[PDB]
Enzyme design. Structure first.
Site, PDB file in Angstrom:
ATOM      1  N   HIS A 151      -6.872 -13.662  -2.732  1.00 21.18           N
ATOM      2  CA  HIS A 151      -7.701 -12.811  -1.888  1.00 21.18           C
ATOM      3  C   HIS A 151      -9.190 -12.922  -2.195  1.00 21.18           C
ATOM      4  O   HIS A 151      -9.994 -12.380  -1.435  1.00 21.18           O
ATOM      5  CB  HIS A 151      -7.283 -11.334  -2.033  1.00 21.18           C
TER       6      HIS A 151
ATOM      7  N   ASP B 213       3.070 -16.202  -1.606  1.00 19.17           N
ATOM      8  CA  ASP B 213       2.823 -14.772  -1.760  1.00 19.17           C
ATOM      9  C   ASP B 213       3.062 -14.062  -0.427  1.00 19.17           C
ATOM     10  O   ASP B 213       2.784 -14.617   0.636  1.00 19.17           O
ATOM     11  CB  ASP B 213       1.378 -14.573  -2.236  1.00 19.17           C
TER      12      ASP B 213
HETATM   13  C1  LIG Z   1      -1.468   2.093  -7.177  1.00 16.70           C
HETATM   14  N1  LIG Z   1      -0.362   1.653  -6.342  1.00 16.70           N
HETATM   15  C2  LIG Z   1       1.034   1.990  -6.647  1.00 16.70           C
HETATM   16  C3  LIG Z   1      -0.644   0.892  -5.156  1.00 16.70           C
HETATM   17  C4  LIG Z   1       0.400   0.448  -4.376  1.00 16.70           C
HETATM   18  C5  LIG Z   1       0.144  -0.264  -3.219  1.00 16.70           C
HETATM   19  C6  LIG Z   1      -1.161  -0.533  -2.852  1.00 16.70           C
HETATM   20  C7  LIG Z   1      -1.383  -1.323  -1.555  1.00 16.70           C
HETATM   21  O1  LIG Z   1      -0.741  -1.008  -0.604  1.00 16.70           O
HETATM   22  N2  LIG Z   1      -2.310  -2.432  -1.410  1.00 16.70           N
HETATM   23  C8  LIG Z   1      -2.367  -3.034  -0.087  1.00 16.70           C
HETATM   24  C9  LIG Z   1      -2.843  -2.098   1.030  1.00 16.70           C
HETATM   25  O2  LIG Z   1      -2.411  -2.183   2.134  1.00 16.70           O
HETATM   26  N3  LIG Z   1      -3.812  -1.072   0.688  1.00 16.70           N
HETATM   27  C10 LIG Z   1      -4.346  -0.137   1.667  1.00 16.70           C
HETATM   28  C11 LIG Z   1      -3.519   1.146   1.775  1.00 16.70           C
HETATM   29  C12 LIG Z   1      -4.130   2.298   2.242  1.00 16.70           C
HETATM   30  C13 LIG Z   1      -3.393   3.476   2.353  1.00 16.70           C
HETATM   31  C14 LIG Z   1      -2.052   3.485   1.992  1.00 16.70           C
HETATM   32  C15 LIG Z   1      -1.440   2.331   1.512  1.00 16.70           C
HETATM   33  C16 LIG Z   1      -2.178   1.156   1.402  1.00 16.70           C
HETATM   34  C17 LIG Z   1      -3.147  -2.969  -2.493  1.00 16.70           C
HETATM   35  C18 LIG Z   1      -2.663  -4.402  -2.749  1.00 16.70           C
HETATM   36  C19 LIG Z   1      -1.305  -4.641  -2.899  1.00 16.70           C
HETATM   37  C20 LIG Z   1      -0.861  -5.932  -3.124  1.00 16.70           C
HETATM   38  C21 LIG Z   1      -1.745  -6.988  -3.229  1.00 16.70           C
HETATM   39  C22 LIG Z   1      -1.181  -8.401  -3.441  1.00 16.70           C
HETATM   40  O3  LIG Z   1      -0.157  -8.627  -3.993  1.00 16.70           O
HETATM   41  N4  LIG Z   1      -1.897  -9.500  -2.844  1.00 16.70           N
HETATM   42  O4  LIG Z   1      -1.457 -10.830  -2.923  1.00 16.70           O
HETATM   43  C23 LIG Z   1      -3.114  -6.758  -3.077  1.00 16.70           C
HETATM   44  C24 LIG Z   1      -3.566  -5.463  -2.841  1.00 16.70           C
HETATM   45  F1  LIG Z   1      -4.892  -5.195  -2.692  1.00 16.70           F
HETATM   46  C25 LIG Z   1      -2.218  -0.070  -3.635  1.00 16.70           C
HETATM   47  C26 LIG Z   1      -1.962   0.647  -4.788  1.00 16.70           C
HETATM   48  K   LIG Z   2       0.951 -16.145   1.539  1.00 21.39           K
HETATM   49 ZN   LIG Z   3       0.576 -10.478  -2.649  1.00 23.17          ZN
END
Ligand SMILES: CN(C)c1ccc(C(=O)N(CC(=O)NCc2ccccc2)Cc2ccc(C(=O)NO)cc2F)cc1
Ligand SMILES: [K+]
Ligand SMILES: [Zn+2]
Ligand SMILES: [K+]
Length: 357
Positions: free
Chosen positions: A133, A171
């Site tokens: 990313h 991924d």
């Molecule tokens: C602290 N905990 C348990 C979390 C769990 C989950 C997220 C999470 O949903 N993400 C993505 C997302 O949509 N966010 C916006 C949002 C706003 C409101 C509600 C839910 C989500 C962060 C993320 C996860 C994976 C990767 C990765 O793997 N990339 O390759 C990269 C990331 F940036 C964030 C935090």
């Molecule tokens: K991918």
């Molecule tokens: Zn991912």
């Protein structure tokens, strides 16, 4: 006929000082490494040393301003670190984060160099924080520097600028940074499979759709395979490989294959929502080993079920070592929307690849 492995426990120093349960855990890499031991895979590999990437090497893909800012975080106090990280999309930073992102990149540099000079045939890089990313000028989605993109450019810097590099990014999320870095480039073919959901899934951009095929001389060298409306797993990933990834990749004929190997499309992942099995990842790895005379480097990206990623990445290393792939059913039917997705990619890329026509 040697398989390389790089792992440095110092990459665990990067952590979230305000949420100790944040899914991008230090023990992601230590659980993968310990599972390699338990399965007796480690002793079958040649241990490649980690090293720091240099600032010059980071400049292969990243701006001086972006490098400078992340570098400056090594010296910041906790509340300044929190303020810095909050300015990005989904980033936490500690005073060890810069050093760990350097170690992830330099570990992959060392592995790519061992592959290209013939010290090993292939390699696996158990590294964190992830990379795909990260953009030329910013951090995002747990990623500081685009490790896979930097490795492609490093690879070219120690062989030829024309070295043909394929990046397969399995991924569950789109590698927005990798796509953008190579979008106008025909020396690096980027193929990404990802949960898309009509642009609603992270990183939330229609850049990830199938109609983004590249720019300029890069037209055709960016292949997006976006999944919509369905829990995808082994049948869908096998079919994407048979109909899209391998025909395109074979026609491109890469000299090095980098896998942005996130394991968050795995069965059991707490946020991917998909169900690729360890056998599935093994099948994908074995398929890619038929390219580039086997010169394949598997680079950890995402993946958040500790047991799932440990089993999945270990199976990939088992394939690189020459173990026989598990037998899978190539005749299980696809979920309906996956056929629609694969057909949409074929229409978009048939103009560029004779192997699809
Ligand atoms: C602290 N905990 C348990 C979390 C769990 C989950 C997220 C999470 O949903 N993400 C993505 C997302 O949509 N966010 C916006 C949002 C706003 C409101 C509600 C839910 C989500 C962060 C993320 C996860 C994976 C990767 C990765 O793997 N990339 O390759 C990269 C990331 F940036 C964030 C935090
Ligand atoms: K991918
Ligand atoms: Zn991912
Ligand atoms: K490209």
């Amino acid at each position: 006929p040697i398989t390389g492995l790089v792992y440095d426990q110092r990459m665990m120093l990067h952590h979230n000082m305000w949420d100790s349960h944040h899914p991008e855990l230090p023990q992601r890499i230590s659980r993968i490494f310990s599972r390699h031991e338990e399965l007796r895979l480690l002793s079958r590999c040649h241990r490649i040393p980690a090293r720091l990437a240099t600032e010059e090497e980071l400049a292969l893909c990243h701006s001086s301003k972006h490098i400078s800012i992340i570098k400056s975080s090594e010296h910041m106090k906790p509340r300044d670190l929190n303020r810095l990280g909050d300015e990005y999309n989904s980033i936490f930073i500690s005073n060890e984060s810069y050093t760990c992102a350097l170690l992830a990149a330099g570990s992959c540099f060392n592995s790519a160099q061992a592959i290209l000079t013939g010290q090993v045939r292939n390699a696996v890089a158990i590294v964190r924080p992830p990379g795909h990313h990260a953009e030329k000028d910013t951090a995002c989605g747990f990623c500081f520097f685009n490790t896979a993109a930097l490795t492609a450019r490093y690879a070219q810097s120690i062989t030829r600028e024309s070295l043909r590099v394929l990046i397969v990014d399995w991924d569950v999320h789109h590698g927005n940074g990798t796509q953008h870095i190579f979008e106008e480039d025909d020396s690096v073919l980027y193929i990404s499979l990802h949960r898309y959901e009509d642009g609603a899934f992270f990183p939330n951009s229609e850049d990830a759709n199938y109609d983004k095929v590249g720019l300029g001389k890069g037209r055709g060298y960016n292949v997006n395979i976006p999944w919509n409306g369905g829990k995808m797993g082994d049948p869908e990933y096998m079919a994407a490989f048979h109909h899209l990834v391998m025909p395109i990749a074979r026609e491109f004929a890469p000299e090095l294959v980098l896998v942005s190997a996130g394991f968050d499309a795995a069965r059991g992942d707490p946020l991917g929502g998909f169900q690729v099995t360890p056998e599935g990842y093994a099948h994908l790895t074995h398929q890619l080993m038929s390219l580039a005379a086997g010169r394949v480097l598997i680079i950890l990206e995402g993946g958040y079920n500790l047991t799932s990623i440990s089993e999945s990445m270990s199976m990939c290393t088992s394939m690189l070592l020459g173990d026989s792939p598990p037998s899978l059913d190539h005749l299980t039917p696809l979920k309906t929307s996956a056929t629609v997705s694969i057909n949409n990619v074929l229409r978009a890329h048939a103009p560029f690849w004779s192997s699809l026509r």
